Write a protein that binds this ligand. Structure first.
Ligand SMILES: CCCCCCCCCCCCCCCC(=O)O
Lengths: 238, 252, 267, 117, 57, 106
């Protein structure tokens, strides 16, 4: 006969609670564990594995394997633009469907750096230099190499080691940023420009290709788990 | 230097002059079964020299308009030596693999392969109401190959061979989470993986469960000028490692 | 679980290149942004607490709902237990290959009155019974059957108005982990069914009214919520891109990789 | 979500006619879009579908030569072009958006195509 | 009587929980098992390579 | 091609109305019933042997197993005077049944 008094919140069903519950099968014994390789303890071990990002979207390459190759050829002028895309890893349709951008669509906030590994998939005699620039927002998109050399950049030279890592920094006013498209927390643009040409010898194909990867640094964080907008359902699967 | 290796297993040796470092599993080297994890009560048969050696599978030609290939892994070695004669007589089985894909070209060719080793890969049928048969899923040490178009729904039981969805429904670019290694003809020349035994049961039957799949997908296709050699083949050599079997029965 | 902080840096001119790597070796570079530029000494108090496998998965999500009518013989619902009939839970459980978890199972039972024709209808509170038949047990075939005794099968009894019922289920499996994928046949001659449907044998779930048909038919509805606890996950997997097709298998119609933009230089 | 077709059209025997099915309210490049013909004295008949993300069409075995389905991802419409019009092809043509497995959930209202002289 | 007095999660205070039932599958959720080993998914390489040294010697 | 055999049914208001359509071989419960209004709007009613679609009133009910299936309206109203098809989804191509128009008795 201990007197209690039931507070508000009684007899509700909250879908994210932590209570105890009466077991349905008493004195059940489980099957003992086994050392299965590759145990994941945290979702920031899946986001730190690089994945190829489909830069070359031109409305008839998304239904092919040609969406991953950024084409690079030998020019006649200098200072052209290889590619360019804004850096919103949950709303931009370039970084939307990679391995990083899909774990980031379950969460709402994110913070930390983003690595961007490039790889030169060309011949063995072709050389060249590329300028991988990143410009924080406030101005427009950079239009010339004279305007994109002012931001964060790194001058890549191809050779024996054939891959270079541009690590974008974390320059932002808030501690976190929204995954969805919000112009209050815009994150900037990533471009890439010809420093010098692509010079080839005789009897080598002049059109080379470039792959690009994307992962997160060792200080990535996420917050405020939500449900993803990419999957859909009308009827039950039967 | 750090460019030359020499792998020795059984009575075979695979040497190489330029190749990248080896990619071992999810972190663990293949080893035998313990005593606090086993479930069978009869003593296993570990030959360890009669199976653990490099078997050479068939060679496929890399064309310019080529799509990809796949080998289902404990099915391709079903007629290879005393490994295919221990799979038929024993009920259970437990193996780890050591895959080594090798494709060589000169300094005037270009291209890029993706050598991945996907565990528990289910393939989707063409007509959405059925399931693919055995002969369209895997061939006896012969490569089944992808396509660059879509297999229509007019076919009854055939595997969907759209390469940009990799047959399973995932994006092809997201396959780099599985243990993988690139073959870039600019620098690299061969790519080697070491795969432990990844399964939920300590031992498994080997004729109705293909627990690995070796996929090769060309991301940047082959290209050369006029004059170079146009026939570039790809050869895969696969060796078991730390094998043991239980339950001896008749031939099946 | 506090994340790492960036240490200070200085302008260098040396033969050590942290930017250049070789991506051919299947090994992601471990560079820090203090190695490609100049940085300050900030200390991160950010935590990675809300991205572990426990907090990512321990959330209730509906899996099936079935309706049954009072004023009918063989008015009772049944469900073969599997978690592959919704899309928002099937995508979370197919990020990892092998899982091992203990459930916490909750039902939300509602009711609705049917258009009867008798005048001055008044029905009292209703009682529902939810029986769980393991694979092989006896099954009922009508509403008033002998199999509804629950002599050994677990079951709950719930009057309306109270809090929703909730049990807890331990790890009921044969092997050492729930396998979400299975590439192999059932027969040893390699025919018959193929896929994940050969591993799923988890029972059935029967529901019925306890009260009898007084004066007006009452149609009910019961929604079923799963909630995994003490989760361990092995061998991660790339997420599903195409739309789901069936319950038994992994079929799909092919879809392009991403949506399209107008150029390669556009933003 | 609704599918809005074109108006009722008219064509001579031997000419060509082009219908439309403007999908609105959802993402056009994900779901396939089918075409179903109902002659006014019989039941419904299937023609063939089109995947709008990859432009892979697959017709029935009786309408393989006449129809030519096409689509564009920009304005989010799906076209259907008939050729070699006879007096058999005077019917009502619906477009349907095939959801999960085989269930035609959202239908159009249908254009009446008639041939005359 | 048991009463494992643990700590609470806050930014930058104790709390008591008691187990009542005999089945180990009927406790609370874990929610506080923070462990990270990302060296098996990003560096699955036998012979290790230093960050400052070149990769292909 | 699976031949789907189902003509012109009559029943009064507020009665039990039953339609049946029969396939050629066993289609394994993959039957869907549609409803065409007299103006020309078509909608999905029952997407399995028994499972009702969301947005359909609870008058309609289905049954059947093997080859022969059925649709049962346990109380006929004025809004349910339409034409009902049945469609299989088991074998390419998807073939529809013939119509079944309803009408009042006297
Ligand atoms: C209160 C009585 C009813 C109790 C019913 C217990 C139901 C147990 C369900 C087993 C879990 C199913 C998991 C499916 C496999 C997977 O995770 O893919």
């Amino acid at each position: 006969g201990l007197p209690v008094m039931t507070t508000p919140g009684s007899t509700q069903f909250l879908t994210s609670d932590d209570f105890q519950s009466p077991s349905a099968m008493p004195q059940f014994d489980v099957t003992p564990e086994m050392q299965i390789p590759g145990r994941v303890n945290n979702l920031m071990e899946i986001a730190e594995v690089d994945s190829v990002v489909p830069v070359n979207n031109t409305e008839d390459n998304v239904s092919s394997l040609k969406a991953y190759q950024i084409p690079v050829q030998s020019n006649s002028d200098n200072g052209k633009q290889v590619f360019g895309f804004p850096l919103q890893p949950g709303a931009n349709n370039v970084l939307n469907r990679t391995l990083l951008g899909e774990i980031l669509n379950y969460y709402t906030h994110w913070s930390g750096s983003i690595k961007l590994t490039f790889m030169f998939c060309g011949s063995a005699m072709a050389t060249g230099k590329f300028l991988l620039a990143y410009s924080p927002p406030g101005a427009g998109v950079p239009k010339n190499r004279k305007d994109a050399m002012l931001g964060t950049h790194v001058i890549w030279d191809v050779g024996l080691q054939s891959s270079c890592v541009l690590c974008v920094p974390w320059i932002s006013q808030t501690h976190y940023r929204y995954v969805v498209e919000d112009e209050y927390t815009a994150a900037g643009y990533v471009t890439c420009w010809y420093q010098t040409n692509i010079v080839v010898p005789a009897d080598v194909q002049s059109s080379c290709d470039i792959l690009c990867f994307v992962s997160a640094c060792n200080d990535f964080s996420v917050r405020m788990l939500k449900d993803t907008p990419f999957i859909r359902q009308d009827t039950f699967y039967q | 230097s750090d460019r030359v290796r020499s792998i020795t297993l059984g009575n075979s040796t695979i040497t190489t002059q330029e190749c990248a470092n080896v990619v071992v599993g999810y972190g663990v080297w293949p080893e035998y079964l313990k005593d606090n994890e086993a479930t069978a009560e009869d003593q296993p048969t570990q030959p360890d020299v009669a199976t653990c050696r490099f078997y050479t599978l068939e060679s496929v030609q890399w064309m310019k308009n080529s799509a990809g290939w796949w080998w289902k892994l404990p099915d391709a070695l079903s007629q290879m030596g005393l490994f295919g004669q221990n799979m038929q007589y024993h009920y259970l089985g437990r193996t780890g693999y050591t895959i080594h894909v090798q494709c060589n070209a000169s300094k005037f060719h270009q291209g890029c392969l993706l050598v991945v080793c996907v565990p528990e890969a289910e393939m989707g049928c063409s007509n959405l109401n059925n399931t693919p048969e055995f002969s369209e899923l895997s061939g006896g040490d012969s490569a089944r190959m992808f396509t660059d178009t879509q297999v229509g729904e007019s076919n009854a039981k055939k595997v969907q061979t759209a390469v940009w969805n990799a047959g399973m429904g995932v994006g092809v670019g997201n396959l780099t989470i599985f243990p993988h290694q690139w073959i870039n003809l600019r620098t690299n020349n061969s790519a080697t993986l070491v795969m432990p035994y990844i399964n939920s049961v300590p031992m498994d039957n080997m004729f109705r469960h293909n627990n690995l799949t070796l996929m090769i997908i060309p991301f940047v296709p082959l290209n050369y000028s006029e004059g170079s050699s146009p026939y570039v083949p790809i050869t895969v050599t696969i060796a078991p490692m730390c094998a043991e079997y239980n339950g001896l029965r008749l031939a099946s | 679980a506090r994340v790492a902080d960036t240490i200070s840096s200085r302008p260098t001119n040396s033969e050590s290149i942290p930017a250049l790597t070789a991506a051919e070796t299947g090994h992601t570079s471990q560079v820090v942004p203090s190695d490609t530029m100049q940085t300050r000494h900030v200390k991160n108090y950010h935590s990675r607490s809300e991205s572990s496998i426990e907090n990512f998965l321990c959330r209730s999500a509906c899996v099936y709902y079935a309706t049954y009518t009072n004023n009918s013989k063989k008015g009772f619902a049944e469900w073969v237990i599997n978690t592959r009939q919704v899309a928002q839970l099937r995508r979370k459980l197919e990020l990892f290959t092998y899982l091992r978890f203990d459930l916490e199972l909750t039902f939300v039972i509602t009711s609705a009155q049917q258009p009867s024709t008798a005048s001055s209808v008044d029905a009292p509170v209703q009682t529902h019974q939810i029986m769980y038949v393991p694979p092989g047990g006896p099954v009922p075939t009508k509403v008033k059957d002998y199999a509804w005794q629950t002599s050994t099968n677990p079951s709950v009894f719930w009057t309306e108005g109270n809090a929703p019922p909730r049990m807890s289920i331990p790890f009921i499996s044969i092997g050492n982990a729930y396998s979400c994928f299975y590439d192999g046949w059932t027969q040893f001659s390699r025919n018959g069914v193929y896929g994940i449907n050969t591993l799923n044998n988890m029972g059935t779930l029967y529901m019925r009214h306890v009260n009898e048909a007084g004066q007006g038919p009452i149609k009910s509805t019961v929604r079923i919520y799963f909630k995994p606890k003490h989760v361990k996950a092995w061998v991660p997997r790339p997420p599903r891109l195409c739309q789901y097709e069936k319950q038994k298998n992994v079929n799909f119609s092919p879809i392009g990789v991403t949506t399209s933009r107008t150029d390669i230089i556009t933003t | 979500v609704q599918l809005q077709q074109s108006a009722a059209e008219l064509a001579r025997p031997g000419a060509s006619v082009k219908m439309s099915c403007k999908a609105s309210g959802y993402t056009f490049t994900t779901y396939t879009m089918h075409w179903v013909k109902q002659r006014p004295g019989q039941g419904l008949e299937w023609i063939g579908y089109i995947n709008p993300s990859s432009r892979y069409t697959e017709y029935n075995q009786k309408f393989k030569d006449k129809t030519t389905l096409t689509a564009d991802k920009s304005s989010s419409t799906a076209y259907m072009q008939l050729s070699s019009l006879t007096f058999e092809d005077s019917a009502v043509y619906y477009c349907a958006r095939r959801s999960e497995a085989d269930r035609f959930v959202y239908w159009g209202q249908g254009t009446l195509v008639t041939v005359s002289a | 009587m048991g009463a494992q007095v643990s700590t609470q999660k806050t930014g930058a205070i104790h709390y008591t929980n008691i187990n009542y039932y005999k089945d180990a599958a009927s406790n609370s959720a874990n929610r506080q098992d923070f462990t990270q080993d990302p060296g098996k998914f990003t560096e699955p390489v036998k012979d290790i390579m230093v960050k400052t040294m070149p990769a292909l010697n | 091609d699976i031949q789907m055999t189902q003509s012109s049914l009559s029943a009064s208001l507020g009665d039990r109305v039953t339609i049946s359509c029969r396939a050629s071989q066993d289609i394994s419960n993959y039957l869907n019933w549609y409803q065409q209004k007299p103006d020309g709007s078509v909608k999905l009613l029952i997407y399995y042997t028994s499972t009702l679609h969301s947005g359909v009133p609870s008058r309609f009910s289905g049954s059947g197993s093997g080859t022969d299936y059925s649709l049962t309206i346990n109380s006929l109203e004025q809004e349910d005077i339409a034409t009902y098809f049945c469609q299989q989804g088991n074998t390419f191509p998807f073939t529809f049944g013939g119509g079944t128009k309803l009408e009042i008795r006297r």
